[PDB]
Write a protein that binds this ligand. Structure first.
Ligand code: HEC
Ligand code: HEC
Ligand code: HEC
Ligand code: HEC
Ligand SMILES: [Ca+2]
Ligand SMILES: [Ca+2]
Ligand code: NA
Ligand code: NA
Ligand code: NA
Ligand code: NA
Lengths: 124, 355, 376, 131, 376, 354
């Protein structure tokens, strides 16, 4: 609610902008438009590229690598928008940059942004 | 008993007496000084191995045995993906079912039959004692029991810490004992953000307990025939290696040309690369992937030959969804991935990286 | 009391803690059922728009479909597909216009047909559901054209092709009653039956005038195709009911949704989708409030429910929000859907007690239209 | 602000939804996107079709005919949205209906709605709607 | 003190009382001048978007331009034209992609050129002004491509044609210094000078490295083409300046926008267009606020003004709103433009006193980018 | 005085001594009993009028003189549109310059020259009195001064209340003395919402003080030649009527085929319609506009003939922006427009309405 305060993760609600895995999300949470935490909504196309962040999990004290993926090929969902930038670096370090539309590899050359999923891929 | 089975396997593994002319043991082709792969030069360089007869070449590259014990037994998972098993085409269910195959294969150790293998075991007073203690009196008198026990022992030895030590720089970094260089860390970040981790990580999501940089699935990445290896093997210019489809019982033509995703552990020291040893250098194996993503002319040319990569041996069922990632690896990111993959080398093989 | 986002955090933490793997993939929406509800956002005339597919029981968005400029949605009553007639331009809102029909699979939401409509023939208007209509067999889509004159376009969904335009009189809206017949409402106050073949001028018959010239019938009547019941309120809440189930129009006794005393006190219907009809219960629901007579498009805060056979009032609900459109599920213990354009929120009520059960917010820029399948 | 209360026209601010000529506008006031009360913004196309309302002018006590015109060929402006319905009739009396996109006759066959202008063409009253 | 809507009501009433006729027509925008400002609304990644053309002196919208998905705007410094690189799809946000450049007349706003870019080559990213750039003669537009690898597209605006792609190293952004040359910022901490022709490998020369791997240079540096001055803040408000006016890079002394005490108390720049530069005054403006280190894209409520030569602070303005983006007019007594993505409002301030003078609201859904011409 | 001058014009207007054989006066072709148009049937019906010689027919339909005094003098406006003047091609600047022309036209009143006109004027003692009182002694002895004075009186007579009384139903309704019927009110709304008001209304916006249902501009609406009238005029099958381009001093090719937008006052009683009298019925003139909008096959057919309307006489400069409105008039709207236009009939012509 103070936008400039240090971001404080929680592990109790995935539709909120402070949910721990959304620490470098930029866009919309897929769970709010018919996807789930780690699945795209019907009719969208899953990008094969990703972006990474190290997100602290308050449930177990561990930091995990979140390799975000966009679901693509639809206009932006408009539901549960969020923009977090924990660890986020400028475009010249693109593996950590989150303004890029990371829809690369999506089926049917889909390149429009609908929402983002937040799967874990490792520990920091 | 767990120790004893594996110690018996240790003796078999280095015993040339399990080969027809007694020239070759498992350790001949799977040399522990080379991450359990074959240093010997044959008619096709190091791409394929020469059998006990001194003449017959195989048609696949000899893989490492390191970390092979982490692979699940062969099965079809719920999404209809085959997973697990042993050999590049998964035709063995598990290590125990694989162990007896080199022994009876005329292009490898070339023993005529189980009875001949049992007759060799029996000749050795140490095998009589060691086998009988684990399997019962008379085991070596019954060719089927003796062959089955020898495979068991061999599989048990490959499941030991010696084959899967988890002491690479990567493992040490993950335990917090050391740090990647910026270049290694960059290569790790590339590996995880580009398509590589879609096939060369154990899990789709979450955290693996013992990562071996393979999902144990079968994929056709569209490799060409290795012509000198295929000429050495004698299978013929018209032969096609159908990978998984060649496993007895698989009939699905969508499995044609699919090969098991290798573990990338020790990849830096186990060249040449792919199921037919077609690429000499680790860099070249990585650049192969840019043929699906880059539009530059250089992307269609194998840097070792100066010639096009070649037409796929099996030009159907390519894993295009994963391969066509939309992003090519520039030279700095190929540099980074080599640096990262070198961190997957077991500690005892670090001396091998120089060369 | 546990929210969907909370339940989903717990399931994700358990999967993590247990080491349960799962493959990131594209989900399928749950099977269409009585409680699926579709909300269309015309977005106040924006060049691109959205439809939200919602599970009314959970109060959860289960999918979305993108549309172009002022699209008309339709939903097959048996749940087998949904479709729309839509309009795009080669440079956002300018350049070459393309009108088209897409049919979608109701669980993958993937287009199974994309049918171009020649010579940009759609009527572009604030969304009226019965300006684009399916025949009861689901094999034909009929759409209205206003320019250069009232006309109706025939689209074959089975063969995936536009067929032809039908010339009609000075009439509006399209209520299909058979594979080859539909009714329209004419400026002179009659209904017109339009019976159409694979070729020809259609055969067109009129009823007698059923309303006078100073009685104004709203743009959003309720039509139950399975009942053949057309329910058509006027600006005062007088309700015309027409039975089309014999294949010809029979006019039922008119009913008043509001009493004389309420009308004298300024009660009037108002909103966008002002009227709903529940077939199995034979019940009519009307959005009403106290309002000046020319504020007929403003939100209303009350719903009146009445027995369609007798016109007796069964209930009057205070909705508790500014509501523009209502509709109901067609199952037993129906839900009453109450959409607020201003709040961009679908409020989901028990239709019997009128009590609010749950709501779905963030539904686009100016959502206005609710559509349900009648699957019973 | 009571949305259901009888609408009360003013003659002091054309950008407000209660300005007297806007008594049956539906969309956005052109003056808020680079047009003016009776002109289209640059880049848009002025329709020839029109919709009418008798709008009472509180200043001089007369009722005027406003024949609204749409400016077309752009996405909706998003500035100064308004919906009034004084004397507004259902679609089957299209001369008085305001949910219709009245972009007919616009140059280049422009048919997308950007904003609406509010010119006077005449005095007068309607049977259904007279002051 | 009279508002523009009140002035117009007065004028229209006087014309009515005087019986004055006038013909409804399409207006022309006023001639481009120093106080025109353009605001682009990427609309939080929506498939279609809008640019508002604004008279900064009146605080009035004088025009709009529609765009597609995340388009890149450019404005000729001499006022002769504006243009954007844009992307559309055959069915709203899916189907066949077309990337194109359109050039517009700055007073009629009509497209005077529509130029297709082959093979969908634009980089789709939240909007960075220096990802698409005019050469100083205005004859060529250069745009960045990220996929499959960094490359730069060359578009001949005079001949209205796509020319070629250039392969570049691992570098980002495009700052043109001559008809045939521009600079980029490399991952390794250098700039790369790229000199190109119609065909042939471009001549690429790297400058010296000028910053460490852990100083992060923002995505929105200011670049004054007429001064050849590149003003590049880091996350901490340290400012790199590069003098490109000789045609080669000369590194100027770095300045700190914030004092050591302010940095110790949590002051950092933050927002979107965090920095502006006034050529004639040789002054730098930076959006700053007290914030956590990884809240670098949030709005800020303060602007510090400093002398570019000495780094001395001239002012610290309290903006009185949540500001994401700033720019200045390039004339004498310039305006400071302060855009709030959250309020969708442009606040127009006196750049000398910092006082808010007027504002323009309802600027789309999530307006982020301010562009002006340097006409002097 | 202004009164006197017009009273002189009233005399001239019905005087056949202004024609060569004394067979016709202004009033013969502009009959006051028929809103100052020509009731007589000639070789092409009522399409064109017969001259003093009893054989010559013109090539254009005789217009009403009702309301002609409201038309501004010919000029080119700031948008480059020509407006005003007299005749269907605007070739006369104003009513004064127009009045002398039928007098000398061999296909009309056929006087050989101004001197012949003066001589007839001098022969009448009432004219010697009336002209001399207004213009000075000897006026009629000078052919130029006599002819110019005759034209001034006639122009003055046409600018009196008797030509432009503003007493139609439409006028009474706008003064709030009575109401339109429902049909007439629908008709008015149709006229304002469809393309008609783009050309047939004095102003672009605001309220006209004395509306005459024309903007006084020049348009080519793509009318076909009237075959029988063209034959009767004797101008030859090769003749093309170029409308405004035929005015001396107009050279701009874009004015070819354009004609002055007529006032619609008394339109119900002044058929046949258009510059060449091609359509006899008011409903047909209205249906003509559907040819640019409707896609029904009947839109292409002239209902009076059952055959295609015919190609435009001049196939360039058509006012397509205004004509191609995207909206067809259905029969109910055509009925409503007829009912509205009938309300523009002056009080004294209401009995002709049947
Ligand atoms: C060279 C002549 C060999 C000798 C002697 C042995 N092995 Fe081997 N090994 C060889 C090849 C060419 C291959 C791949 C063949 C193919 O068809 O795919 C193998 C493979 C195995 C594997 C599977 C490993 C994996 O798929 O990742 C195992 C477990 C294995 N080899 C073990 C093994 C043992 C126990 C041996 C002595 C009995 C033995 N090998 C001998 C080449 C040769
Ligand atoms: C599945 C679609 C894959 C993706 C994406 C990548 N790899 Fe892969 N890799 C895959 C298979 C099925 C194989 C064996 C192919 C065969 O038929 O022989 C490989 C092999 C490698 C190797 C050689 C390992 C060895 O021979 O022991 C290397 C070094 C390798 N792969 C690396 C690699 C990298 C760095 C990737 C991202 C660019 C990558 N692979 C993607 C399956 C797939
Ligand atoms: C029939 C033989 C006529 C006699 C006698 C007069 N007029 Fe006429 N009038 C006639 C025609 C065919 C036309 C149109 C010709 C064309 O080329 O356009 C006219 C026109 C006028 C007008 C112009 C009205 C308008 O354009 O709206 C005026 C003012 C006019 N006529 C007056 C007039 C006078 C004063 C006459 C006696 C001197 C006179 N007319 C005789 C047909 C005939
Ligand atoms: C400008 C492009 C016009 C539009 C739109 C309409 N009309 Fe018109 N009208 C116009 C002209 C230039 C003319 C004369 C054409 C010629 O060359 O003769 C006309 C004529 C009429 C008439 C005949 C009147 C008469 O002959 O005295 C009528 C009845 C008429 N117009 C009516 C009409 C209606 C009802 C319209 C909307 C459907 C309409 N016009 C459109 C100019 C234009
Ligand atoms: Ca190898
Ligand atoms: Ca006539
Ligand atoms: Na080889
Ligand atoms: Na098989
Ligand atoms: Na004729
Ligand atoms: Na001429």
């Amino acid at each position: 609610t103070d936008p400039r305060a240090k971001w404080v993760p929680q592990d109790n609600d995935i539709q909120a902008c402070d949910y721990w895995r959304h620490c470098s999300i930029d866009g919309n949470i897929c769970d709010c438009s018919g996807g789930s935490l780690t699945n795209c909504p019907p009719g969208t196309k899953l990008a094969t590229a990703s972006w990474v962040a190290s997100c602290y999990n308050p449930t177990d004290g561990q930091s995990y690598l979140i390799a975000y993926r966009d679901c693509c090929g639809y206009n932006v969902s408009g539901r549960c928008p969020c923009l977090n930038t924990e660890g986020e670096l400028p475009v010249y370090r693109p593996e950590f940059a989150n303004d890029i539309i990371w829809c690369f590899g999506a089926e049917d050359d889909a390149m429009t942004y609908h929402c983002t999923i937040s799967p874990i891929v490792g520990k920091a | 008993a767990d120790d004893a089975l594996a110690a018996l396997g240790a003796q078999l593994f280095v015993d040339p007496a399990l080969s027809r002319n007694a020239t070759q043991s498992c350790a001949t082709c799977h040399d522990p000084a080379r991450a359990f792969t074959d240093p010997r030069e044959g008619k096709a360089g190091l791409a394929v191995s020469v059998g006990d007869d001194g003449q017959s070449h195989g048609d696949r590259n000899t893989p490492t045995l390191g970390y092979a014990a982490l692979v699940p037994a062969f099965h079809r998972d719920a999404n209809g993906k085959y997973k697990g098993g042993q050999f590049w085409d998964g035709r063995a269910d598990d290590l125990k079912q694989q162990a007896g195959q080199p022994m009876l294969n005329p292009v490898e150790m070339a023993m005529p039959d189980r009875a001949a293998v049992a007759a060799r075991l029996r000749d050795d007073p140490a095998y009589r004692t060691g086998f009988e203690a684990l399997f019962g009196k008379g085991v070596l008198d019954d060719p089927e029991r003796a062959f089955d026990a020898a495979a068991e022992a061999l599989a048990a030895y490959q499941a030991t810490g010696e084959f899967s030590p988890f002491d690479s720089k990567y493992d040490r970094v993950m335990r917090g004992e050391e740090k990647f260089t910026p270049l290694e860390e960059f290569g790790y970040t590339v590996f995880i953000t580009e398509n590589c981790r879609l096939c060369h990580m154990q899990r789709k999501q979450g955290v693996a307990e013992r990562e071996t940089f393979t999902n144990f699935e079968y994929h056709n990445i569209g490799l060409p025939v290795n012509e000198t290896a295929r000429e050495a093997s004698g299978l013929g210019a018209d032969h096609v290696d159908h990978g998984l489809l060649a496993r007895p019982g698989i009939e699905d033509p969508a499995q044609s040309g699919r090969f098991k995703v290798p573990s990338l552990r020790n990849v830096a020291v186990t060249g040449p690369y792919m199921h037919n040893g077609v690429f000499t250098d680790l860099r070249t194996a990585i650049l192969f992937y840019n043929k699906y993503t880059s539009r530059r002319p250089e992307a269609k040319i194998n840097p070792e030959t100066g010639a096009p990569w070649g037409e796929p041996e099996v030009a159907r069922n390519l894993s295009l969804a994963e391969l066509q990632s939309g992003l090519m690896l520039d030279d700095g990111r190929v540099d980074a991935l080599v640096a990262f993959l070198e961190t997957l080398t077991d500690r005892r093989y670090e001396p091998l990286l120089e060369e | 009391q546990e929210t969907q986002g909370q339940a989903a955090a717990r399931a994700a933490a358990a999967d993590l803690a247990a080491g349960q793997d799962d493959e990131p993939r594209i989900l399928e929406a749950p099977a269409p059922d009585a409680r699926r509800v579709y909300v269309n956002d015309p977005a106040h005339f924006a060049a691109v728009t959205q439809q939200f597919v919602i599970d009314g029981e959970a109060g959860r968005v289960i999918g979305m479909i993108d549309g172009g400029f002022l699209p008309n949605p339709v939903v097959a009553d048996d749940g087998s597909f949904i479709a729309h007639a839509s309009t795009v331009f080669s440079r956002i809102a300018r350049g070459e216009r393309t009108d088209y029909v897409e049919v979608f699979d109701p669980v993958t939401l993937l287009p199974t047909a994309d049918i171009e409509l020649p010579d940009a023939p759609r009527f572009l208007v604030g969304t009226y559901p019965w300006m684009t209509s399916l025949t009861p067999d689901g094999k034909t889509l009929l759409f209205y054209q206003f320019s250069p004159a009232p006309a109706v376009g025939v689209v074959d969904l089975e063969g995936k092709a536009f067929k032809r335009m039908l010339d009609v009189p000075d009439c509006y809206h399209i209520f299909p009653t058979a594979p080859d017949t539909f009714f329209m409402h004419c400026r002179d106050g009659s209904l017109a039956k339009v019976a159409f073949g694979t070729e020809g001028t259609p055969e067109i018959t009129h009823t007698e005038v059923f309303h006078p010239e100073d009685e104004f019938l709203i743009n959003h009547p309720a039509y139950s195709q399975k009942a053949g019941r057309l329910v058509w309120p006027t600006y005062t809440g007088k309700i015309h009911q027409i039975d089309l189930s014999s294949g010809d129009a029979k006019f039922l006794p008119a009913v008043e949704a509001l009493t004389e005393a309420e009308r004298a006190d300024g009660w009037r219907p108002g909103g966008w989708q002002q009227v709903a009809y529940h077939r199995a219960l034979d019940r009519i629901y009307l959005l009403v409030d106290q309002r000046d007579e020319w504020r007929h498009k403003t939100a209303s805060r009350f719903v009146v429910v009445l027995d369609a056979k007798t016109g007796e009032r069964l209930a009057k609900f205070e909705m508790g929000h500014e509501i523009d459109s209502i509709n109901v599920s067609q199952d037993e213990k129906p839900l009453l859907y109450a959409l607020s354009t201003g709040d961009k929120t679908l409020y989901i009520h028990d239709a019997e007690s009128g009590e609010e059960l749950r709501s779905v917010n963030q539904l686009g820029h100016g959502p206005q239209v609710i559509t349900t399948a009648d699957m019973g």
